[PDB]
Amino acid sequence: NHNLHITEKLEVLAKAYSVQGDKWRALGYAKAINALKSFHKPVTSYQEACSIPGIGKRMAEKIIEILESGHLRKLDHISESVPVLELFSNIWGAGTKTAQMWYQQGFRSLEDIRSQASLTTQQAIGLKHYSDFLERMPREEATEIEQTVQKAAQAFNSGLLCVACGSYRRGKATCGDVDVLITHPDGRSHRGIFSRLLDSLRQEGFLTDDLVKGETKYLGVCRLPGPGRRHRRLDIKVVPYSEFACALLYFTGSAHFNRSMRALAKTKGMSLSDHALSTAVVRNTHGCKVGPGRVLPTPTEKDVFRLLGLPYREPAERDW
DNA sequence: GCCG
DNA sequence: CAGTAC
DNA sequence: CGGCAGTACTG
Ligand SMILES: Cc1cn([C@H]2C[C@H](O)[C@@H](COP(=O)(O)O)O2)c(=O)[nH]c1=O
Ligand SMILES: [Ca+2]
Ligand SMILES: [K+]
Ligand SMILES: [K+]
Ligand code: NA
Ligand code: NA
């Protein structure tokens, strides 16, 4: 909380490495930023920095250069392309490779992209909602969106469970988007639901754009009725009842939380996914899986933590 | 970038 | 497959 | 040295 003197400047570098494609270096920065964001005291000494898991020599040296100087020299040598690459990769469906290609082609503005760029179907939808998708909504709107999906789903089968996950479920005041997880306790009635449900939501004009339409994941765009409404990203994921706890866990996040849980499971010979916690997973020397293992029974999220030797954590306690 |  | 996002 | 989470979709 109190190290913003440092994190604020480190975040500029992390983002700069991210948009330029240097994904693992940006992962290092992102981790050290989360570490700093959860210490107890403001870091004041080189040796006090290296004590924190995720902060090494190079990162500690920058941490001191900020206290001795208030500024970090690296920030003055960030490529002039970075603001433009960030602009381009804030389009949904465009990442670092697409942004770098557009930059190499001489594009510098969203007007350039609009008029001259080659765009996928997803990216054109991303661009059309560029401003709207950079906004977080108040959680009260997220409730309305979840309620709209629930009511349409439960109209086909009142046995369907519907749970909004993500930052909503972690109790945040604003939500970048809404993910509604859908299952059925009977273990089979969840099947074949999309075609009807999405049609129901489509007929009223609530769904405005589809980005992904898979057998289990729908990603798209919605807008509530009336004036004053913005387009929002909506996900609907339909899973079998036995995978519900692992799905709830993944889709609730946070992303850094999921990755640290999965990294932990790997060290214990296990494998954790949005489908299941698996055991006796056989892997090779590069950490790649070769043998699948056995699915462990996880009727609730508490079981996942227990099977991993961890104290449970409420959704609100999973920011990192 | 960090860490085993 | 590579790219992207969940 | 070398992995850093695991998977679903798209074209
Ligand atoms: C962005 C992101 C999300 N997630 C998970 C955690 C998020 O709560 C969940 C839904 O993503 P979203 O909130 O961006 O729709 O997906 C990852 O596992 N990895 C990622 O890189
Ligand atoms: Ca979220
Ligand atoms: K450390
Ligand atoms: K265009
Ligand atoms: Na993007
Ligand atoms: Na979403």
Author numbering: 251 to 464, 470 to 575
Study text:
Biochemical assays, site-directed mutagenesis, and X-ray structures of mutants of human Polλ incorporating sequence determinants from P. tetraurelia PolX or metazoan Polβ are used to investigate the origin of their fidelity. These constructs also included the following mutations to facilitate crystallization and diffraction: Δ1–241, KGET, and C543A. Because we could not crystallize P. tetraurelia PolX itself with various DNA substrates, we set out to crystallize mutants of human Polλ incorporating sequence determinants from P. tetraurelia PolX or metazoan Polβ: these structures indicate that a Loop3-based fidelity mechanism is incompatible with the fidelity determinants of Polβ, which is based on a large conformational change (open-to-close transition).
Additionally, two mutants were generated to incorporate Ptet-PolXs-like features into Polλ: Polλxt-K (I492K) and Polλxt-K-SD2X (which also carries E529D, mimicking the SD2 motif of Ptet-PolXs, SDH). These mutants were designed to assess whether Polλ’s enzymatic behavior and structure would be affected similarly to Ptet-PolXs. Unlike Polλxt-K, it does not exhibit misincorporation, but it displays kinetics similar to Polλxt-K with slightly improved kobs and marginally lower KM, leading to enhanced catalytic efficiency (1.64 μM−1 min−1 for Polλxt versus 9.94 μM−1min−1 for the Polλxt-K-SD2X mutant and 6.45 μM−1 min−1 for Polλxt-K). The Polλxt-R-SD2β and Polλxt-K-SD2X mutants were further analyzed via X-ray crystallography in the presence of Ca2+ ions to prevent catalysis. However, no major conformational rearrangements are observed, and the polymerase domain remains in a closed conformation. This structure could be an equivalent of the active form of DNA polymerase β, displaying a flexible lysine instead of a clear attraction of the arginine by the SD2 motif.
